[PDB]
């Protein structure tokens, strides 16, 4: 029975799971693009949201500094996270880290996904664009909207 409980187990326990999530977070901060199973990328995004929030809260704070030093095992990523990814989202709150699903892997056929931050100097992934506002259904909806607006 696991009602209302998340925390998907991966490694041999909580410590190994946290270590793997920290490694994934460091890789996502460095390369800004990582393909991994859906649960791993979901947990990575969930932790990266709070990481970006804490980095945006401030720099001189000792709590955020200790958290960045703990969750980043490369040291050099801390100044980058504090001076690039923090001033970038100064106008956004919690709207970032877009998740996209890929098919399968050519090894064991496992469900994977790729996530990335907004902006991104790398070329954007092919987003599932919706239908244009010129199809029959869209034109009928626009006509009905204009009719109800002129009738009001």
Partner 1 sequence: GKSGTWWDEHLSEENVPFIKQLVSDEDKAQLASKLCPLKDEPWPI
Partner 2 sequence: AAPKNRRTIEVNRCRRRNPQKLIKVKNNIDVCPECGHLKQKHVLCAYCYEKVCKETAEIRRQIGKQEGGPFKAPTIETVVLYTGETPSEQDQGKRIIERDRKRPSWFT
Partner 3 sequence: ISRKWEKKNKIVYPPQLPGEPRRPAEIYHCRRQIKYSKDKMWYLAKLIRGMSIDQALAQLEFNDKKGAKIIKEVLLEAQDMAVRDHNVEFRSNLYIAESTSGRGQCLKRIRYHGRGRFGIMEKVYCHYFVKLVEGPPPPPEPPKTAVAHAKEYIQQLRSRTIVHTL
Question: Which residues lie near partner 2 (CB under 8 A)?
Answer: 30-31, 33, 74-77, 79-80, 83-84, 88, 100-103, 121-126, 128-129
DSSP assigned state of 107:
T
Residue 115, number of CB atoms within 10 A of its CB: 24
Does 138 help bind partner 1 (rule: CB under 8 A)? yes
Radius of gyration of the chain, Cα coordinates, nearest whole angstrom? 20
Does 92 help bind partner 1 (rule: CB under 8 A)? no
- Nearest to partner 2 of 10, 67 (CB atom): 67
Options 62, 76, 108, 131; binder of partner 1; rule CB under 8 A: 131
95 vs 77: CA distance, rounded Å: 22
- As beta bridge partners, residue 116 has 98
Residue 106, number of CB atoms within 10 A of its CB: 6
- Nearest to partner 2 of 110, 122 (CB atom): 122
Task: Enumerate binding residues for partner 1 (CB under 8 A).
Answer: 130-133, 135, 137-138, 141-142, 145, 148
């Amino acid at each position: 029975i696991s009602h209302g409980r998340v925390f998907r187990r991966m490694g041999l326990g909580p410590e190994s799971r946290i270590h793997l999530l920290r490694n994934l977070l460091t890789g996502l901060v460095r390369h800004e693009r990582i393909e991994a199973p859906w649960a791993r990328v979901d947990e990575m995004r969930g932790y990266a949201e709070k990481l970006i929030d804490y980095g945006k809260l401030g720099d001189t704070n000792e709590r955020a500094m200790r958290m960045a030093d703990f969750w980043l095992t490369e040291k050099d990523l801390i100044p980058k996270l504090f001076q690039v990814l923090a001033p970038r989202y100064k106008d956004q709150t919690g709207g970032y880290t877009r998740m996209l699903q890929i098919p399968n892997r050519s090894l064991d056929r496992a469900k994977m996904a790729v996530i990335e931050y907004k902006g991104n100097c790398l070329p954007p992934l092919p987003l599932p664009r919706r239908d244009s506002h010129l199809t029959l259904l869209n034109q009928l909806l626009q006509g009905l909207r204009q009719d109800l607006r002129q009738s009001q």
